[PDB]
Amino acid sequence: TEIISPHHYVYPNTTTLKNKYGIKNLNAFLEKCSHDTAKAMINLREESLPEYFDTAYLCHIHQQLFKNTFEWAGYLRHIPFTFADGTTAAMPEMKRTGWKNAFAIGDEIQEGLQRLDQTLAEKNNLQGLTREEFNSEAIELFNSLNQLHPFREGNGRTQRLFFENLAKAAGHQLNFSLITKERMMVASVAVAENGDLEPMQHLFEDISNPEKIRLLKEFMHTMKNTGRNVNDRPVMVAKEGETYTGTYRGAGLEGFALNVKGAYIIGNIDHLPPEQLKILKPGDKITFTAPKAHHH
C-alpha cells in the first residue's frame, strides 16, 4: 500500500465507487445513492443563499449532497484523500482519448477554481445585470467550471444547483430541472469539441425566459401518465427565427410539440393559426416557423 492512485476511489475488482453504504454492487449502490442525494437536494434548497458564491460554496453543496454517500464528500479530486480503509485516492487527470477535448489536470484544477472565485467576486455574483447580460456571463463560468471537473463524481448535480442559486441571488432564474440529460450532453459537447455556444445559449434561454419556462414545465408535467420518459431525447422551445419541419405531436393549453428528427420542439400555442389547431391531428407533418422581433 502507500501509493496515491485514482484506482483507490473504487472497490477492488469492481468499477463501483467506494461508499459509506458498503455496497459493492454497482446498481444497488446507484439506487441507494440516488435516493439519498434526492433527499439531500430537497433539504439544500431550503437553506439560505450565501453572501459569496465561490468554490467554498461549491464544495459545501457537494459535501451536503453526498455526506451520506462518500467519505470524500466535500473534497475536490486533486486533493489526495485517505479512506478509512487506509488507502488514499486522487484524480488530478480525468483522461479522454487524445483526439477528444481535455479536463483540467491536477494543479490546473485549483488555478481555475481561483479564477472562478476571482471573477465572481469582481462581478458581485453577477447581481446588477439583465438576463441577457447575466446569462452571457454565467455561461462563460458554467463552461469554465465544466472543463475543470472538480469532483470525482457528482459534478453535474452540484454545478447546476450552484448556478441555479447564483441566478436566484442575482435576481434571475435557471430552472435546470427542465433540461433533459441528453440536452446537457449535447450543449456541453458542442462547447468542448467545437467551441460552439449555440446550444448552450439556447439551453440557458429556455431555462431563464419565463415565457419559455412556462412551456417546458407543461411538457415535462404531461410526461406523467403515459408509461414513458424523455431524458434520451433533447426537448427545446423553438428559436425565434428558426423553422422546424417535423410530425405534429398534439397540443396542451399553452404549447404544442413537434417531432423534428427525433428531438421534441415546443411551440407557443398562440403562434399557430387557431383555424389550424382544430384541424391538426397528431402525426401530420408540419413546417413551423417561430416568430421573431429584433429591436435595433
From Swiss-Prot:
The residues listed in the UniProt record as binding ATP, with positions renumbered to this chain, are: F83, A84, R96, T97, E153, G154, N155, G156, R157, R160
**Which one GO biological process term can you cite for this protein?**
symbiont-mediated suppression of host apoptosis
EC class, as a word, reads: transferase
Keyword check for Cell wall biogenesis/degradation, yes or no: no
The entry's localization annotation reads: Secreted
In alphabetical order, the GO MF annotations are: AMPylase activity; ATP binding
The enzyme's E.C. designation: 2.7.7.108
What Gene Ontology cellular-component terms does the record carry? extracellular region
Q: Which keywords does this Swiss-Prot/TrEMBL entry list?
A: ATP-binding, Nucleotide-binding, Nucleotidyltransferase, Secreted, Transferase, Virulence
Keyword field contains Lyase: no
Cited function: Adenylyltransferase involved in virulence by mediating the addition of adenosine 5'-monophosphate (AMP) to specific residue of host target proteins.
Name listed for the protein in its UniProt record: Protein adenylyltransferase
This protein's species is Bartonella henselae (strain ATCC 49882 / DSM 28221 / CCUG 30454 / Houston 1) (Rochalimaea henselae)
Q: Which residues of the full protein are shown?
A: 11 to 303 of 544
